[PDB]
Amino acid sequence: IPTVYDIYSRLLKDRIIMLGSQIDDNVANSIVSQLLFLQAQDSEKDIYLYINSPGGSVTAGFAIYDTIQHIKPDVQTICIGMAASMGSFLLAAGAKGKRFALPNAEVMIHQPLGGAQGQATEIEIAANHILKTREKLNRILSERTGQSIEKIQKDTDRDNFLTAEEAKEYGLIDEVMVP
Amino acid sequence: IPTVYDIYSRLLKDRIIMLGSQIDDNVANSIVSQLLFLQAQDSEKDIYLYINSPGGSVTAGFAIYDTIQHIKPDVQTICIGMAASMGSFLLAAGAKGKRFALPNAEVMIHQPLGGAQGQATEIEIAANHILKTREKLNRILSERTGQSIEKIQKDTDRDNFLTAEEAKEYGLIDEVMVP
């Protein structure tokens, strides 16, 4: 990581937050803290969330999502490289009109993944929980994209890769950022 | 890593970016950040991307590619040692007339590599995705080299090693940098 400040700390001074890895609790706690800190510095100026992420934990993703919606500043989202799974969910969570992707960026949507071992009753609880999680994700994606819950359900049944242009047509982003 | 600043931070002060490893998300996020920072310091002065890389992630590579094309400064590319796979793609992505290799540098082009496991339908989705990725790479390489898509397809079917001089003849670089 080169020095100019380390580069990421220098970008944070200009209200740029990097989501450039797999989403786990540590990443979420850091992004949440950054969002709240930037709001405290200035509650009116835009924040910029740059996304290059294969996704990860749904609960960690929701910590970030809820923090974005809670704060007063608009959070712009820019997909560079890849936004997959919870990554693409967060891309779609940026302020309306301010969600972008670079032309060759890859967006991917699919259903949540998980696991369950033990007694029939325990597997039932795990299944009910992951299905309820999927309903919650699909409902929010519906609101953010303008697509029906029924269409989101069908389109996320297996891995679904979108070009930047396709992500725009879908309503996951507002504009393809052209040079 | 010797101190003079650490050497790489000292080179970044003169607008030199080192791509000297395998391309993963961390490397891409760092290079992208460096490019944007240099543009903010001066939107007119050239940037110099030195490449010694066996390649890596295609999506990480495209984050770098798209950032190069997006910013206003010309990005010169210099292959030292090796530029293979996504490394050679990025070498070819430098400003026209400002793509170089040292005389004994190795350039290698080939088709994308990947994997797929599961149901027939899942393998189909994975195959369609990697073939579409190859089409995208080949199209851009065609534009950057002046070779036909048909010739790129044939020449990348297996590992294809080029000398600096051969890379120049091919249109991957503009000049061999002679001592």
Binding site: D14, D46, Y48, Y50, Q76, I78, K98 | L36, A40, H70
Partner: peptide, 6 residues
């Protein structure tokens, strides 16, 4: 990536 982000 400015303009406009930032």
């Amino acid at each position: 990536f400015s303009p406009x982000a930032p």
